Amino acid sequence: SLLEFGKMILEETGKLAIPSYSSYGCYCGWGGKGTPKDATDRCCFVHDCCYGNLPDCNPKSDRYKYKRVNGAIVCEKGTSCENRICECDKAAAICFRQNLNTYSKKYMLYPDFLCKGELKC
User: Fold this and answer.
1) How many domains is the chain partitioned into structurally?
2) Containing domain of residue 30, as a range?
3) Which residues pair with 66 in a beta bridge?
4) Of 38, 41, 47, 62, which one is the catalytic site residue?
5) CA 26 to chain centre
6) 41, 56, 62, 89: which one is catalytic?
7) 89 is a catalytic site residue
8) Which organs or tissues contain this protein?
9) Is 62 an annotated catalytic residue?
């Protein structure tokens, strides 16, 4: 869930998921429309495409477990969903860390009426 996911962001970027990533750009939040402003937003877009490809699961609700092995996130092996969801979050959490150098405060609390366009997964 967002509880597990928030731990990953914190544990990889050193920042609190909320409010640093809960309302960023066009895809780091509840919505999802238009073109990703930058790399970080792009991280959010693909993460949406990952959740969107788990029809039989409920990404935001289902809880799951993971651990640290050599400092790297290791998704355990509960249910397929738990596993899949955990794998979607880890990719995203690391995508966040990998692009920290281009993170912009200017895309925080971005108004969604400025997110125009379309992008397939």
Assistant:
1) 1
2) 1-121
3) 75
4) 47
5) 12
6) 89
7) yes
8) Expressed by the venom gland.
9) no
